[PDB]
Design an enzyme around this catalytic site. Structure first.
Site, mmCIF file in Angstrom:
data_model
loop_
_atom_site.group_PDB
_atom_site.id
_atom_site.type_symbol
_atom_site.label_atom_id
_atom_site.label_comp_id
_atom_site.label_asym_id
_atom_site.label_seq_id
_atom_site.Cartn_x
_atom_site.Cartn_y
_atom_site.Cartn_z
ATOM 1 N N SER A 6 -26.241 26.060 -18.662
ATOM 2 C CA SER A 6 -27.359 25.816 -17.751
ATOM 3 C C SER A 6 -27.131 24.580 -16.870
ATOM 4 C CB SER A 6 -28.667 25.623 -18.508
ATOM 5 O OG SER A 6 -29.690 25.540 -17.510
ATOM 6 N N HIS B 275 -16.011 6.995 -11.044
ATOM 7 C CA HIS B 275 -17.185 7.403 -10.264
ATOM 8 C C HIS B 275 -17.447 8.888 -10.647
ATOM 9 C CE1 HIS B 275 -19.938 7.927 -6.873
ATOM 10 N NE2 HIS B 275 -19.689 6.679 -6.491
ATOM 11 N N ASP C 103 -30.402 -6.222 -4.520
ATOM 12 C CA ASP C 103 -29.580 -5.992 -5.724
ATOM 13 C C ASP C 103 -29.699 -4.514 -6.129
ATOM 14 O OD1 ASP C 103 -28.628 -8.603 -5.835
ATOM 15 O OD2 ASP C 103 -29.681 -9.152 -7.690
ATOM 16 N N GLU D 44 0.852 -1.188 0.000
ATOM 17 C CA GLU D 44 0.000 0.000 0.000
ATOM 18 C C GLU D 44 0.885 1.233 0.000
ATOM 19 O OE1 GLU D 44 -0.193 2.610 2.288
ATOM 20 O OE2 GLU D 44 -2.143 3.555 1.799
HETATM 21 O O1 LIG Z 1 0.012 6.032 -2.801
HETATM 22 C C1 LIG Z 1 -0.955 6.391 -2.119
HETATM 23 O O2 LIG Z 1 -2.075 6.679 -2.816
HETATM 24 C C2 LIG Z 1 -0.957 6.630 -0.646
HETATM 25 C C3 LIG Z 1 0.095 5.815 0.021
HETATM 26 C C4 LIG Z 1 0.306 6.315 1.412
HETATM 27 N N1 LIG Z 1 -0.931 6.185 2.186
HETATM 28 C C5 LIG Z 1 -1.001 6.817 3.459
HETATM 29 O O3 LIG Z 1 0.015 7.038 4.133
HETATM 30 N N2 LIG Z 1 -2.300 7.143 3.920
HETATM 31 C C6 LIG Z 1 -2.467 7.573 5.281
HETATM 32 C C7 LIG Z 1 -2.106 8.970 5.370
HETATM 33 C C8 LIG Z 1 -2.969 9.862 4.695
HETATM 34 C C9 LIG Z 1 -3.574 10.665 5.745
HETATM 35 C C10 LIG Z 1 -2.698 11.646 6.373
HETATM 36 N N3 LIG Z 1 -3.182 12.954 5.970
HETATM 37 C C11 LIG Z 1 -4.396 13.496 6.507
HETATM 38 O O4 LIG Z 1 -5.069 12.888 7.335
HETATM 39 C C12 LIG Z 1 -4.794 14.836 5.979
HETATM 40 B B1 LIG Z 1 -4.899 15.062 4.270
HETATM 41 B B2 LIG Z 1 -6.139 16.261 4.035
HETATM 42 B B3 LIG Z 1 -5.636 17.753 4.784
HETATM 43 B B4 LIG Z 1 -4.458 16.729 4.003
HETATM 44 B B5 LIG Z 1 -4.073 17.468 5.530
HETATM 45 B B6 LIG Z 1 -5.501 17.391 6.448
HETATM 46 B B7 LIG Z 1 -6.792 16.711 5.581
HETATM 47 B B8 LIG Z 1 -6.339 15.047 5.270
HETATM 48 B B9 LIG Z 1 -5.972 15.786 6.810
HETATM 49 C C13 LIG Z 1 -4.263 16.262 6.779
HETATM 50 B B10 LIG Z 1 -3.622 15.804 5.218
HETATM 51 C C14 LIG Z 1 -3.794 7.256 5.780
HETATM 52 O O5 LIG Z 1 -4.830 7.221 4.849
HETATM 53 O O6 LIG Z 1 -3.963 7.005 6.975
HETATM 54 C C15 LIG Z 1 0.758 7.713 1.470
HETATM 55 O O7 LIG Z 1 0.002 8.699 1.586
HETATM 56 O O8 LIG Z 1 2.120 7.927 1.334
HETATM 57 ZN ZN LIG Z 2 -1.102 3.019 5.839
HETATM 58 ZN ZN LIG Z 3 1.325 5.134 5.194
#
Ligand SMILES: [O]C(=O)[C][C][C]([N]C(=O)[N][C]([C][C][C][C][N]C(=O)C1234B567B89%10B%11%12%13B85%14B%1158B%12%11%15B%139%12B%1061B%12%112C5%153B%14874)C([O])=O)C([O])=O
Ligand SMILES: [Zn+2]
Ligand SMILES: [Zn+2]
Ligand SMILES: *[C@@H]1O[C@H](CO)[C@@H](O[C@@H]2O[C@H](CO)[C@@H](O[C@@H]3O[C@H](CO)[C@@H](O)[C@H](O[C@H]4O[C@H](CO)[C@@H](O)[C@H](O)[C@@H]4O)[C@@H]3O)[C@H](O)[C@H]2NC(C)=O)[C@H](O)[C@H]1NC(C)=O
Ligand SMILES: *[C@@H]1O[C@H](CO)[C@@H](O[C@@H]2O[C@H](CO)[C@@H](O[C@@H]3O[C@H](CO)[C@@H](O)[C@H](O[C@H]4O[C@H](CO)[C@@H](O)[C@H](O)[C@@H]4O)[C@@H]3O)[C@H](O)[C@H]2NC(C)=O)[C@H](O)[C@H]1NC(C)=O
Ligand SMILES: *[C@@H]1O[C@H](CO)[C@@H](O[C@@H]2O[C@H](CO)[C@@H](O[C@@H]3O[C@H](CO)[C@@H](O)[C@H](O)[C@@H]3O)[C@H](O)[C@H]2NC(C)=O)[C@H](O)[C@H]1NC(C)=O
Ligand SMILES: *[C@@H]1O[C@H](CO)[C@@H](O[C@@H]2O[C@H](CO)[C@@H](O[C@@H]3O[C@H](CO)[C@@H](O)[C@H](O)[C@@H]3O)[C@H](O)[C@H]2NC(C)=O)[C@H](O)[C@H]1NC(C)=O
Ligand SMILES: [O]C(=O)[C][C][C]([N]C(=O)[N][C]([C][C][C][C][N]C(=O)C1234B567B89%10B%11%12%13B85%14B%1158B%12%11%15B%139%12B%1061B%12%112C5%153B%14874)C([O])=O)C([O])=O
Ligand SMILES: *[C@@H]1O[C@H](CO)[C@@H](O[C@@H]2O[C@H](CO)[C@@H](O)[C@H](O)[C@H]2NC(C)=O)[C@H](O)[C@H]1NC(C)=O
Ligand SMILES: *[C@@H]1O[C@H](CO)[C@@H](O[C@@H]2O[C@H](CO)[C@@H](O)[C@H](O)[C@H]2NC(C)=O)[C@H](O)[C@H]1NC(C)=O
Ligand SMILES: *[C@@H]1O[C@H](CO)[C@@H](O[C@@H]2O[C@H](CO)[C@@H](O)[C@H](O)[C@H]2NC(C)=O)[C@H](O)[C@H]1NC(C)=O
Ligand SMILES: *[C@@H]1O[C@H](CO)[C@@H](O[C@@H]2O[C@H](CO)[C@@H](O)[C@H](O)[C@H]2NC(C)=O)[C@H](O)[C@H]1NC(C)=O
Ligand SMILES: *[C@@H]1O[C@H](CO)[C@@H](O)[C@H](O)[C@H]1NC(C)=O
Ligand SMILES: *[C@@H]1O[C@H](CO)[C@@H](O)[C@H](O)[C@H]1NC(C)=O
Ligand SMILES: *[C@@H]1O[C@H](CO)[C@@H](O)[C@H](O)[C@H]1NC(C)=O
Ligand SMILES: *[C@@H]1O[C@H](CO)[C@@H](O)[C@H](O)[C@H]1NC(C)=O
Ligand SMILES: *[C@@H]1O[C@H](CO)[C@@H](O)[C@H](O)[C@H]1NC(C)=O
Ligand SMILES: *[C@@H]1O[C@H](CO)[C@@H](O)[C@H](O)[C@H]1NC(C)=O
Ligand SMILES: [Ca+2]
Ligand SMILES: [Ca+2]
Ligand SMILES: [Cl-]
Ligand SMILES: [Cl-]
Ligand SMILES: [Zn+2]
Ligand SMILES: [Zn+2]
Lengths: 692, 692
Positions: free
Chosen positions: A572, A631, A608, A370
């Site tokens: 708009s 998203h 669902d 990570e």
């Molecule tokens: O590659 C990628 O993508 C990522 C990897 C790694 N991963 C972590 O390490 N991760 C953690 C930390 C962040 C948080 C701290 N930071 C805060 O909480 C904050 B941010 B915004 B403004 B700016 B200042 B006021 B508000 B929030 B508060 C302060 B800083 C947690 O998730 O646990 C890093 O970054 O290097």
């Molecule tokens: Zn971490």
């Molecule tokens: Zn970290």
């Protein structure tokens, strides 16, 4: 009985404490033998604890490490080329750990190699607005300079991207005591503050959700085709290195050129915070030289995946995931979270051994890498995307359980707001002064909602953690919760990503009784329990309708800063407001039907509809130039990966629009993003309509 | 009882005949008032017939029409600029229809305007290999020439793309009697052959699945943001116009330059089929001049959507769709299909009025603007993509029911092979000589499978019809079926897209007793009935395993034409064969479980596994430069939209690879496509694994 209360009562603070101590005695850096050994231990223990199946899922991903025999450092060099000052080669190790080997020295993961030499410019936090102030207002040119920036405010990867686009030839990151030293508290080991020799590690990629830089789209499995380094996603083009404030003082004190533009640019060191470029009169011939020799290396990583098969809907997955890899000892980040997960698994397994099973399948994950870019969670989700797409109910993250000892912090989808309210009303507050009161009461008191009196603040999800692939790529309802500080009375926590983040930091200064850890286990675990057991999924679509209107109001008000352009180009927001009104109306009718239906097809049909509601906000075309952020309501801010942005497509089309040279084309793209958002909201609403 | 037999017995040949006559008396060109009137009639009748709900779904899409007061035509011009020969302005209308108004004259929909003048080059069928032969072997340069090409072999849009890439400044399409005049049969009205004045209409877009050229990704609804024409998807850059063989003879007869390279380049006209460029000695100063004045216009189109709500799984959709818009009268294309759909709806509605409902929801569709690029089906699917993604069981297409009177033709997903076998064994053959025998027996006799004795040919789906968005974009199992000619003893059917396609053509020459129409209604309708009613979905995953191995063998054999490059670049198909072996093994185990499980969750869980199996072949990143072709096993051929290609990503990476200037990069991309295909096959297999 086997009910939530049984689950919750089985959780023990003393167990979390034992597990934290066990997980934090040696470093568990991604890709190292020690972290593979911990993975194997977790796998064995989760089997012992009673899970049905526990497997390792491994991938070969790009990682980055300093060169052991050619260390990284920064110099001030005189005109003769003598290096007259050198930054430190390591943080002084904490008491009793001075003989631990394989502590990785501070470095910026994925920096290219180089030995650039040049004049310094100080860029404050290196935010988009800091570069606007430098270039537009102060008329300072960063091209071919080395930039020095203080950590804080925004993700370090955005700082590096901003410096690179300004033409810098290198970046020095440092921790200023203004942001990492709380007044009246002592430095580690005597308190929880960052010492002058302490340094924050961390990657500086701009992945935008891609995962392994070499295999965007697809898991980095044994037969994967990899991009060449030149086509890799997200790698910086200029060398970068972090330092502590003792060293930063030595680099900053000789700075000349312009004065800082205002006090928001001055930290707490005894230096003027001049912007430069370069040093004052006497030293104007000295320069700064970086020496970076880190190498990028494809390296094996290991996720642990535990399964507790559902009794009724085994093909519905509720996922509790958090990472295991750490920069050094990981006392808070991540092991305070992983110890909580370990105790949650133990409790569920106790119930299982007595004959209980959850309604839906629960998946437990210990993610790897990570810290190098959400690599382990993202590769595994790329591998399993079709299963997750069609079966994923919810994802609950489980990184650091504490970043303070003041009150609760929750960021989640609006679909989980009512769940979180109801759960916290049934939990005991651990806070002094609130004995006998609910967690809801203490949290609402200390962190009031800005919109509604009598309710607590709950924030949008941003990014910089392992929920990113599940939420912003796949559209699976996601949430996270931890204990936090009083933001009203420094940046993250001071010792974040430093060698000083240890078991002792937690046990002495944050949570000696492990009661905040226990409360966080009850919140994360209770959420997983309700999601996996409740007959009707515990999501309230009406909460999304409320926030969609708030976000529509907000994006409209940003646009209305430019009334003349909105008239000229016929910009708009009516379609978006119409879609939000329709979503509100349809969600209200769906809720009535949900209250008003013995029929398991209608139930599962309506479950669902609830499960696929988050999914309906995904656009398979992605956002512009960010194909893994799909998203339409939520993406990580283009200026700060940690912060969430609402209606991001419209927000980015409007950002700094007055600077665009072709306004017709820029406002055309605003209108395009309004159309995409209005359509996606209406399409999401229609998934809640009667099905035929 | 209300069972399949009841459904099938209610279908009547005499009804199909009445509906065909009713649908073919006036033209129903997309975007015209007449076609809107027919839409309203169909909506009213489907309500009368008993459907629960019947709505119009309208969109405003780019269409194309000739200019009524400025007609399109081609000339031969002499050096003085006199137009000494002009092509016809209309087809002679058929007997009794010479006073019908609003017959659209022949034109190529979406041609740009222009009056290019130049020397002719004859390019045979304008296929990729015809241009290879011209440019590589004969050394003939098409740049700045007008190309003349005969219709047939491949989609006309691919012909235009090929001519455009060769540098042509215009394209003339014509119907050669070699391809459109069957020996021993007379011209319309006295037989089913194309007369010399007959002309095939048709669009010449290269949409690659995009739908409306102006709104790729999103429905063309009231608030849609549209691209400018310059950024529209798929429009040709050079003028194009179709002619009949009387006119083509006049353009071809003076052709000089090189002789045709072999007899495969010569059609049946009394001309030498010289390639050119330009005319022989005496006429070398005459040129060809096109005059094209058609305009592209955003125009409203109307789909009719009928719903018969399911009794048990109303949130599962089985779709029967075919288009309603025609070039002129649409005697075969599409009304022979639409009359069949109309009778199917009538039969289902008869059962509904007696208290019956299907298990799953059936959706019936009358699509608009199919002839202008599958626009109506594609816009509606873009609008409803999330509902279709999560709920779509199957799509059965319903364009032309006949293109001959010899035997059945089926193209479908392998998931439907066993369904089609079982259904046709229970249906009566309509063929002379097979009275009392099954349709399976007659079809197997006349169209034997090339792989297995005792089984009939079933083909892959290509494209050029309304299933494209459902199958290759969304991954919904899809199929089509019609009666066809003996391919063993001309191109499509001769009068395809001509004014001569009328009710009388069908009633006099193709199907006077409407028995082939009735058999096709029994096949399409019976398939919909089983898909919507069968307790377990009627898909056999093992059939996919068999074809995946065939396709893997095929793509491996293409690559093995280049053994030295496969050694040098380490090009291995092992991952793909491994994935196919695994899919075979897992599918076999899933089938056992499917036989071996009273539990409606296990059932619906396993029905969901069956439904989402086609869906697992979709890659959300699309194929290279074709983002709306997402299915990794099947795409329309890059050289011929009508034909399907298997493992298209690998096929296109290998195509003409020996001509690429950087072989390392070209073979790298082959390896990348092998990885993507192997991964997607394994991922699809794993959706059939036990779920937890
Ligand atoms: O590659 C990628 O993508 C990522 C990897 C790694 N991963 C972590 O390490 N991760 C953690 C930390 C962040 C948080 C701290 N930071 C805060 O909480 C904050 B941010 B915004 B403004 B700016 B200042 B006021 B508000 B929030 B508060 C302060 B800083 C947690 O998730 O646990 C890093 O970054 O290097
Ligand atoms: Zn971490
Ligand atoms: Zn970290
Ligand atoms: C929110 O929900 C409502 C449904 O309650 C939904 O209302 C729909 O709005 C559309 C788009 O405005 C309406 O579209 C109209 O449909 C009629 C036929 O029913 C057409 O005749 C109309 O077109 C004419 O008028 C236009 C506007 O002036 C002209 O531009 C055009 O050239 C035509 O002359 C028009 O297309 C639709 O009828 C309603 N449906 C209802 C009321 O049931 C609204 O669209 C939803 N919001 C979003 C963002 O989807
Ligand atoms: C089809 O299904 C089979 C499952 O029956 C599946 O087999 C899997 O193959 C992978 C990829 O080859 C195996 O991966 C190995 O896993 C072990 C740990 O279990 C590792 O130690 C191995 O790595 C070492 O050896 C490699 C190969 O020489 C070296 O390159 C590497 O550097 C390491 O030294 C290796 O990653 C996996 O164990 C099996 N799973 C089984 C047998 O259960 C196969 O992958 C499937 N086909 C496809 C296309 O997915
Ligand atoms: C969080 O807790 C609240 C309060 O307990 C939950 O709302 C309550 O949910 C129940 C169950 O649906 C509602 O009961 C219903 O009442 C109507 C009569 O009005 C009746 O027709 C139904 O058969 C049923 O008894 C109750 O009204 C409702 N209270 C509210 C909305 O104030 C809420 O569902 C919980 N949120 C979750 C679980 O995500
Ligand atoms: C097409 O028709 C064939 C032949 O009727 C169908 O295959 C048959 O399907 C049935 C139902 O699953 C199988 O019956 C099973 O037999 C085993 C004993 O071996 C028993 O354990 C089960 O409980 C059940 O009775 C039958 O074997 C099978 N015949 C075969 C495969 O040759 C086929 O399913 C149909 N295809 C469809 C509907 O798509
Ligand atoms: O836009 C798009 O996309 C499309 C549109 C339209 N649409 C149609 O029209 N559509 C139809 C026809 C096709 C077919 C014919 N054609 C054939 O059949 C054939 B193709 B392939 B080869 B080629 B040749 B051999 B094989 B197949 B056979 C002959 B041709 C059907 O579908 O019906 C067109 O095309 O124009
Ligand atoms: C953390 O806890 C684990 C689990 O108790 C310890 O691992 C065990 O070590 C004992 C004694 O060396 C062995 O007999 C077991 O095989 C181990 N079990 C495993 C790996 O599942 C581990 O040594 C502890 N780590 C620390 C630093 O205390
Ligand atoms: C900073 O570190 C550098 C590199 O180790 C030191 O400069 C080296 O000093 C040695 C011995 O004096 C020389 O033989 C090398 O040639 C030097 N290397 C370089 C790159 O200059 C330097 O003395 C250190 N500066 C301080 C103040 O400690
Ligand atoms: C095709 O059939 C329809 C349905 O019978 C005919 O439409 C009806 O026409 C009658 C008499 O003009 C009206 O009373 C009805 O209102 C119509 N019903 C509808 C539109 O649902 C239609 O005229 C026929 N077309 C042709 C060419 O015969
Ligand atoms: C082909 O059509 C063109 C256009 O209608 C004819 O040429 C025109 O003839 C009229 C009357 O002779 C002239 O006034 C126009 O100036 C001509 N127009 C053009 C564009 O040349 C031509 O005669 C026709 N050729 C044949 C053989 O019918
Ligand atoms: C580390 O130090 C030097 C840099 O040139 C070299 O001897 C060795 O190859 C380096 N290790 C690497 C690059 O992994
Ligand atoms: C700043 O840096 C260099 C000066 O050499 C120049 O090339 C670049 O264009 C300058 N940019 C601006 C915006 O002044
Ligand atoms: C723990 O809580 C006490 C009591 O408010 C506070 O003064 C102290 O600063 C907290 N410790 C940390 C690390 O926040
Ligand atoms: C059709 O004919 C001429 C072409 O210039 C013109 O008078 C009229 O505008 C045209 N109609 C169009 C372009 O729709
Ligand atoms: C063919 O056409 C023109 C001749 O003027 C030229 O520009 C073009 O490059 C030629 N191409 C080839 C492949 O001969
Ligand atoms: C109909 O079938 C007869 C009998 O084989 C055949 O000779 C005739 O060509 C067919 N008509 C058409 C249009 O195919
Ligand atoms: Ca990857
Ligand atoms: Ca569209
Ligand atoms: Cl977290
Ligand atoms: Cl069809
Ligand atoms: Zn058609
Ligand atoms: Zn057609």
């Amino acid at each position: 009985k086997h009910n939530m209360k049984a689950f919750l009562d089985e959780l023990k603070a003393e167990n979390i404490k034992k597990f934290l101590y066990n997980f934090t005695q040696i470093p568990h850096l991604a890709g190292t033998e020690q972290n593979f050994q911990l993975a194997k231990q977790i796998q064995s223990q989760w089997k012992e604890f009673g899970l049905d199946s526990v497997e390792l899922a491994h991938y070969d991903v790009l990682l980055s490490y300093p060169n052991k025999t050619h260390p990284n450092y920064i110099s001030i060099i005189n005109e003769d080329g003598n290096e007259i000052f050198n930054t430190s080669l390591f943080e002084p190790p904490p008491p009793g750990y001075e003989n631990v080997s394989d502590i990785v020295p501070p470095f910026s993961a994925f920096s290219p190699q180089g030995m650039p030499e040049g004049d310094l410019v100080y860029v404050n936090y290196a935010r988009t607005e800091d570069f606007f102030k430098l270039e537009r207002d102060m008329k300072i040119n960063c091209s071919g300079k080395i930039v020095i920036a203080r950590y804080g405010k925004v993700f370090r990867g955005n700082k590096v991207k901003n410096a690179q686009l300004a033409g810098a030839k290198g970046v020095i990151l440092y921790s200023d005591p203004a942001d990492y030293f709380a007044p009246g508290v002592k430095s580690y080991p005597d308190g929880w503050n960052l010492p002058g020799g302490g340094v924050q590690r961390g990657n500086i990629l701009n992945l935008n959700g891609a995962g392994d830089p070499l295999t965007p789209g697809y898991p980095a499995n044994e037969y994967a085709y990899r991009r060449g380094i030149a086509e890799a996603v997200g790698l910086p083009s200029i060398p970068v290195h972090p330092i502590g404030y003792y060293d930063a003082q030595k680099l900053l004190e000789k700075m000349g050129g312009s004065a800082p533009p205002d006090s928001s640019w001055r930290g707490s060191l005894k230096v003027p915070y001049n912007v430069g470029p370069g040093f004052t009169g006497n030293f104007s011939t000295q320069k700064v030289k970086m020496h970076i020799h880190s190498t990028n290396e494809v390296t094996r990583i290991y996720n642990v995946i535990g399964t507790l098969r559902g009794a009724v809907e085994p093909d519905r997955y509720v996922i509790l995931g958090g990472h295991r890899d750490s920069w050094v000892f990981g006392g808070i980040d991540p092991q305070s979270g992983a110890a909580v997960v370990h105790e949650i698994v133990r409790s569920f397994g106790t119930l299982k051994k007595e004959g209980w099973r959850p309604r839906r399948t629960i998946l437990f994950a210990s993610w790897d890498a990570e810290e190098f870019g959400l690599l382990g969670s993202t590769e595994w989700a790329e591998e399993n995307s079709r299963l997750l797409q069609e079966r994923g109910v919810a994802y609950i993250n489980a990184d650091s359980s504490i970043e303070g000892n003041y009150t609760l912090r929750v960021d989640c989808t609006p679909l989980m707001y009512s769940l979180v309210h109801n759960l916290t009303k049934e939990l005991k507050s651990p806070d002094e002064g609130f004995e006998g009161k609910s967690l809801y009461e203490s949290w609402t008191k200390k962190s009031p909602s800005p919109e509604f009196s009598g309710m607590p603040r709950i924030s949008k999800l941003g990014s910089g953690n392992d929920f990113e692939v599940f939420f912003q790529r796949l559209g699976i309802a996601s949430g996270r919760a931890r204990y936090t500080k009083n933001w009203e009375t420094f940046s993250g926590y001071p010792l974040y990503h430093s060698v000083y983040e240890t078991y002792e930091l937690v046990e002495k200064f944050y949570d000696p009784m492990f009661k905040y850890h226990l409360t966080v286990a009850q919140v994360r675990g209770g959420m997983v329990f309700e999601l996996a057991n409740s007959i009707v999924l515990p999501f309230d679509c009406r909460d999304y309708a409320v926030v969609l209107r708030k976000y529509a109001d907000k994006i409209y008000s940003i646009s209305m800063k430019h009334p003349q352009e909105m008239k000229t180009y016929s910009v708009s927001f009516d379609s978006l407001f119409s879609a939000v009104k329709n979503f509100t109306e349809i969600a209200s009718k769906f809720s009535e039907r949900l209250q008003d239906f013995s029929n398991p097809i209608v139930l599962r049909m309506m479950n669902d509809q609830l499960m696929f509601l988050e999914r309906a906000f995904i656009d398979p075309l992605g956002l512009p130039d960010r194909p893994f952020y799909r998203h339409v309501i939520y993406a990580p801010s283009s200026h700060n990966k940690y912060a969430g942005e609402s209606f991001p497509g419209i927000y980015d089309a409007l950002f700094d629009i007055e600077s665009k040279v072709d306004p017709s084309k820029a406002w055309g793209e605003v209108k395009r993003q309004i159309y995409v958002a209005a359509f996606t909201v209406q399409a999401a609403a229609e998934t809640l309509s009667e099905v035929a």
